[PDB]
Design a binder for this molecule. Structure first.
Ligand SMILES: C[C@@H]1CS[C@H]([C@H](NC(=O)[C@H]([NH3+])c2ccccc2)C(=O)O)N=C1C(=O)O
Ligand SMILES: C[C@@H]1CS[C@H]([C@H](NC(=O)[C@H]([NH3+])c2ccccc2)C(=O)O)N=C1C(=O)O
Ligand SMILES: [Zn+2]
Ligand SMILES: [Zn+2]
Ligand SMILES: [Zn+2]
Ligand SMILES: [Zn+2]
Lengths: 241, 241
C-alpha cells in the first residue's frame, strides 16, 4: 500500500494502477490520485476527477507529473474504454497542472481560467490551450466552455490562489473544490503562500452557494467529505482576516 | 503572522519572538514552535517544550535549525532567566534534533535515546552528548538521566520511528508525545517512512498507560489535545496491521 503523509489512505474498492490509485465515487465518476514524494516528508496525494458522459470522458486536473498523467490516460483508455473529450484544470500549480504536456501530446483539448493560463508560465506550468472566462457572479461563460456536458465550472473568487476554480458534476451530488477546500477536520488551510487571505472565506462560501445541493465534496488532498468541509474551511479562513 | 501549511495556527495567548512562537501551557511549562519554510509548499511547524523546574530550565526537542534553537535560548534568557540545565531530544529527525550545535555552543548538556545518537550520523543530525538507555518496561534507566527532575522519560516501543521517546512532566497534567502521537482530528499518522507499522498501535497505547495523569497531550505538529489524541492515534495505527 501507498501510505501518503498527506492524503487519504487506501480503502476497499480502490484500484492501484502503476503509481496511481483510482476510487469510484459514482457510476460515472472516479477520483484519480497521484503522489509526489517529498524527500524526508513522504508522499503527498493529489486528487482529480474522471467523469463519464455518454460516449466520452471529461477530466478535472492533471496529476503531479506528465508521466503520471499519461498513466491516467492509459487507465481511462483501458478500463473505461472511452475517449477523453477535454480536461479542465483548476489553477496554475504543479499538483493541478503539472501534467499538461501529456494531455496535449495525447491530443486532448484543455481548458483553464484565463488567469491560470496567464500565471502558468510564471509557475513553470504549461498553459491550457483554451481560456475560460467568468460572469460577475462567478459562473463560467458558456461560449468559452463548449460541450462541457455535465462539468459545471464556477469561479468562487480568490482564495487558495487568485485563479482557483471549482467544478460541479451535473446529474450527481458531487462538487469538486480542488485545493480551495480543506477537509472538515483540517487544522490548516494548507499552503497560503499565494492566498488571498482577505477573500478566502467568502470564496469558500461562494463555492458552497454555487452547488447548494452537493452532498459529496471532493478536494485535492483529502478523501471525499461532507459539506462540513466547506463550512470548516470558511471558518478557518474567517480567522485570516 | 506565521500561517503554517502543516501545524496548528497562531492563537490568542501565543507570543511571537523572532521567527518563533511561544505559548504558556502551565505556570512552569511553555511550548516552543519553529518553522521550516519549504519552497512551493510553505512552512512546517514543529513543537517542543520548555520547563521551569525549581531553579533551572529543561528543554525538550530543538527547533528545526541551529539559528532557531539559538532563538529559543535567547527567549528563555529573556523570559525566564534561569540556566538551562539540560535538553532531551525525542528522536533523530530534523524537527526534533536539527539545532543540536546551538545547544552545544551554549554549553548545554544534551541527552537522547542511545539509538537516536547511533542513528544521528545517518540522519544527518548531530548526536547528543549523552545517551539514555531504557529498561524492558520502557522507563528510562535513572543513572543515565541525571538531574532530570520532573522529566519522566519513557520509551514506548517503535512507532513513528525505531528510536522515538516520550516525556511526562511530574506535578503537571502534561505529557509530550513528540511525532509519535497525532491529534484527535488527524487524518494520517504523518510520515510513515521510518515507522514500525506492526508495533505502532501498542506503542501509542503504551504511551498513554505510562502517563495516566497527563490530561494535556502535547505533540510535534498540532496544538495540545486531550487524551483522545492517544486513542485516535492508536486506532489509526490499528489500521496498519
Ligand atoms: C500544501 C498543499 C500541497 S502543496 C500544493 C501546491 N504546491 C505545489 O504544487 C508545489 N509545486 C510543491 C512544492 C513542493 C512540495 C509539494 C508541492 C500549492 O502551493 O498550492 N497545494 C497544497 C494545498 O494546500 O492544496
Ligand atoms: C511528516 C511530519 C513532518 S516531517 C517530520 C520528520 N521529517 C523531517 O524532519 C524532514 N527533515 C523534513 C523534510 C522535509 C519537510 C519537513 C521535514 C519525519 O520524517 O518524521 N515528521 C513528521 C511527523 O509525522 O511527525
Ligand atoms: Zn495551489
Ligand atoms: Zn494542493
Ligand atoms: Zn520523525
Ligand atoms: Zn515530526
Amino acid at each position: 500500500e501507498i501510505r501518503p503523509t498527506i492524503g487519504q489512505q487506501m480503502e476497499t474498492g480502490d484500484q492501484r494502477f502503476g503509481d496511481l490509485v483510482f476510487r469510484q465515487l459514482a457510476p460515472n465518476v472516479w477520483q484519480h490520485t497521484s503522489y509526489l514524494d517529498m524527500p524526508g516528508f513522504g508522499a503527498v496525494a493529489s486528487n482529480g476527477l474522471i467523469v463519464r458522459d455518454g460516449g466520452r470522458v471529461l477530466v478535472v486536473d492533471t496529476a503531479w507529473t506528465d508521466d503520471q498523467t499519461a498513466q491516467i490516460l492509459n487507465w481511462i483508455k483501458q478500463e473505461i474504454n472511452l475517449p477523453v473529450a477535454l480536461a479542465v484544470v483548476t489553477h496554475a500549480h504543479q499538483d493541478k497542472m503539472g501534467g499538461m504536456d501529456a494531455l496535449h501530446a495525447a491530443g486532448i483539448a484543455t481548458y483553464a481560467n484565463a488567469l491560470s493560463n496567464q500565471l502558468a508560465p510564471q509557475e513553470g506550468m504549461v498553459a491550457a490551450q483554451h481560456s475560460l472566462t467568468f460572469a460577475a457572479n462567478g459562473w463560467v461563460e458558456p461560449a468559452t466552455a463548449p460541450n462541457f456536458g455535465p462539468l459545471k465550472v464556477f469561479y468562487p473568487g480568490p482564495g487558495h490562489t487568485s485563479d482557483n476554480i471549482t467544478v460541479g458534476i451535473d446529474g450527481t451530488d458531487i462538487a469538486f473544490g480542488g485545493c480551495l477546500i480543506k477537509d472538515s477536520k483540517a487544522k490548516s488551510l494548507g499552503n497560503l503562500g499565494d492566498a488571498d487571505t482577505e477573500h478566502y472565506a467568502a470564496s469558500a462560501r461562494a463555492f458552497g452557494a454555487a452547488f447548494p445541493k452537493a452532498s459529496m465534496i471532493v478536494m485535492s488532498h483529502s478523501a471525499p467529505d461532507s459539506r462540513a468541509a466547506i463550512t470548516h474551511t470558511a471558518r478557518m479562513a474567517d480567522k485570516l482576516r
